[PDB]
Symmetry: C6
Subunit: 201 residues, 6 copies
């Protein structure tokens, strides 16, 4: 990453490398893996972002889809900012430069700590997370329509499933079971989730 | 977080990220998870507080209730402090800015290290903990009325349960079993818990 | 904690938070948990001491007894030092201020690093350890009178039990078994534990 | 490694040493072990690169092949840059010097931090990774021709295998099973992997 | 401990605290626990040395013997250096001061960093290790006389046992079995252990 | 160790202490334990090298052989450099001084950071590794002559064993099984291991 000591490059740590690999192995593309990726890639250069993605062993269908999303975003960067060199001067980053493909670490360090800074780490991380959210949604096994409360299912457990599915992807009342549904209609409109959950406790 | 080096931003650590996720997985909304959250979010920016909350995989009914509490507190912040920009000047944080929704990391860094400082990390953490205490209370399985000492239950074990339930949520004497209750009445008023626990040992 | 960088505040660490919670879970109120608590709370502010105590999940009968001891010590602090404010000046800490109840972190930082320093961290830690020793003694299952050497028990194992019990709470010779007791009387007075343990090997 | 404090030598860490050894033990020469090696050897001297390779216990057929690749690259370095000494002056690194065989740590430190720098760590790491990719390819058990979708195999699982094999080493459509193949031909040309994977969901 | 930043006090770490406790739990008073104790107590104050000893849960017979050895050494310190105060001046450390019993942390910090330094940490550690070696020897289960090579025991395994016992507490040839003994006598005098071990391989 | 802050002494870490002890316990005197020892003892003083060796619990036959090798090297140091004191001046290190036996930590710190430096840490580490390689070779269970490819053994597995044995201690072709041997002779002379391994795949 780049961090303060002045902004300087620091090695990505064994802890960070390990953390990311393990979260992917344990959680796959569960929605909460996105904020974890983002946190572990704090201050990350494009080389670091590529390093973290490369260390993943499985899920190569997903990694391939991620490359496609990244390519799309790179072509849009080049559409918006066409790259136009003078000796010892900073060059303009194209799409592939931001994705760490055609840029060196020094060039990446140069853009990020420049004044004004060109945050190629954050621009790339945005493309990656955009791609990762597309995968999270695809790998979501259940539609929100299929999430309904079972006759003996505690209301809490049903809501946990409802917003879990919704995160990946008055309907809550519709899909509640008959008993709790009657209690919820009795509360009327403008009832908070807290009040609903207490009412069906 | 923000810490001293001067106040500067530091990345949230893999240890901290991991610690929080594991405590939630192991303890759910047991009362003691609140002080742990608060300690792990020491010096935290709103982005950090959102990051920690986002990394939680389950409990989305609870996370939804937390958003509701946060919204309520945000509307009260905007009621108390209406946001009213001049070039290169610091803007006033509204409710959603404190919750990290409509504020950047730089703006957050700017408010927190300003002189005088606007501690948006602590103001937000207060809203979160307020919401988290509401959940702790809701998920408490047992009422204090139902906590009574069994005929062969050691008095210590009963008191452990009594104050455990009470933390989530002369009654102690009333709910004691006949044998220990007689010993406790014999001690009279103004007996400390220590003396009570020794008397029924 | 407060440590040198100048004396400055540092966040309590995930390692420290975890260490304390695990020692309590594994050892409960075994005597050796007191020196571990004291070591893990090195340089601790009252907020830190409260944080460590709060993160404990079980043992709420004990935590309640601890509050009682702390209250007693707070009332004695207020008896000895009655608190008597001038703008931008340091105020005098009362009992509840030392216990972190009515004091902010800044006020705590202010007292501790002041010249001359008012060590509210150490004064509070003393009250806590005083309370913790009272609990260690209470939860000690065996009296030293009941610790006696079994007919086939190695003398070493018996002494391990004898001083273990004694830590929580020529008697050693009296409670030794007949065979080893005769050997010990033959050594006469002024025999060291080493010589006793060798003589009954 | 060499890192900023000025560029200075730092010891390779127990965490780093352990990380590398464990990844090799768990993953052998799975493709993703290359980016992990590269990340763990960030800022590494030739001595460090040799240290990491030496700590590997098994896979000595592979380590021998790696030496061969390294020798080949060393002979090409000597072909391109023949080494031609003056007292207290820096000497020119030959092939074996870059590979850490005939160079001391001080000489390595000297080349790397020189102005202009001769990055012997990165030049050597390139030779090593070049050798490691040759092994990854050799130890790949399956040809991409043999990767075909089973009649009841989810399309996602088949693509995971397809790009996994391809990483080690409209064919994707050809090797799909009859049912999904018909759906894919119906999409026409220029369909993204995302659309293909959704179409066969 | 005390370390360089100038010599300043640093908190004993959770890693260090944990390491010591675990080594004692796993190895008891195996000989190699002494050098581990010494390494973990590097730069340690008397308070730190007492902290490490206090955190040990079992082995209170041994800890009691350790106190006895320490007392003996303290009385010898007071015999050699009788303590003879002037305002704001450093006082002379007596036996109990070195053992951390009657000395504060500040006084300990004062002696250790004084010029010339009075290394009370090292003087105390010497008393402790002297006591610990006495225990290692006592808890050694086997005499070296009883260590003899079994008829089918590999010579290496026998020598491992021989020097293991010897560490706790031409004899090696005498106690070797008939077959290997004849081979060893054939080597003559002045044969190294290496040659002996090869000869009986 | 000694490291840069200026060259200053730092405590050997719990991580480092633990790492070494565990590698010995898991790998004994497998060849790869030598480079691990060397890496973990980076910047080590003789006291540190002795500390690491002392913390090893088993293998006392080997540790004894190591002392013998060290003694031999010490006598050669004294043969080459006879030690010949002036107040407050640095003395000349003899054999036993380099081995940490008759030298203090301060004297060791003094030699190592002197200008010009006398690297007693590296000179001693060389003696130790020289001794450790002698043990690795001795404890190697299999001769390279006994390593031959089984009739159904994959060629890769055989080569792994061949160079494993060779590390501890056209022969590769001779010891290959009939089928693969014919393929290898057909390749002719000057075939690389890569080509051989592919040819017998
Ligand atoms: O140099 C690299 N550029 C990206 C990359 C590589 C190819 C592509 O079509 C899009 C992005 C990448 C990746 C990568 C790996 C998995 C998912 C996304 C990007 N790894 N290394 C690189
Ligand atoms: O940008 C964010 N703002 C909050 C948030 C998001 C929505 C809302 O109604 C209240 C607060 C939040 C959260 C969040 C997640 C779980 C519980 C509480 C807040 N995560 N990210 C953000
Ligand atoms: O703000 C606090 N003050 C103490 C406290 C709280 C109440 C009391 O009667 C005595 C001390 C405390 C504790 C606490 C918890 C368990 C045991 C001892 C003190 N946690 N937070 C606080
Ligand atoms: O000093 C060294 N130089 C390399 C090396 C050693 C021999 C060779 O033919 C090529 C490279 C090496 C290695 C090594 C070990 C395994 C794989 C590759 C290089 N370990 N130490 C050294
Ligand atoms: O303040 C202390 N002084 C020593 C001590 C305590 C009593 C004694 O007779 C000798 C040394 C000690 C110990 C201690 C504990 C176990 C073994 C050796 C010393 N713990 N705390 C203290
Ligand atoms: O002070 C010491 N000097 C060495 C040592 C001790 C005796 C000897 O004959 C050779 C070297 C050593 C060792 C040691 C232990 C195991 C193997 C090699 C050296 N531990 N402490 C010391």
């Amino acid at each position: 990453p780049i961090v303060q000591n002045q902004m300087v490059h620091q090695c990505i740590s064994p802890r960070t490398l390990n953390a990311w690999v393990k979260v992917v192995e344990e959680k796959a593309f569960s929605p909460e893996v996105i904020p974890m990726f983002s946190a572990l890639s704090c201050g990350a250069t494009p080389q670091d972002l590529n390093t973290m993605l490369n260390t993943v062993g499985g899920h190569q269908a997903a990694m391939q889809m991620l490359k496609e999303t990244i390519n799309e975003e790179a072509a849009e960067w080049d559409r918006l900012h066409p790259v136009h060199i003078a000796p010892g001067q900073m060059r303009e980053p194209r799409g592939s430069d931001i994705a760490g493909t055609t840029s060196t670490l020094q060039e990446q360090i140069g853009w990020m700590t420049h004044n004004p800074p060109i945050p190629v780490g954050e621009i790339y991380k945005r493309w990656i997370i955009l791609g990762l959210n597309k995968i999270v949604r695809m790998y979501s096994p259940t539609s929100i329509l299929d999430i309904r409360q079972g006759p003996k299912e505690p209301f809490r457990d049903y809501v946990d499933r409802f917003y879990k599915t919704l995160r990946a992807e008055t309907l809550l009342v519709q899909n509640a079971n008959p008993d709790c549904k009657t209690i919820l209609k009795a509360l009327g409109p403008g009832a908070t989730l807290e009040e609903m959950m207490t009412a069906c406790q």
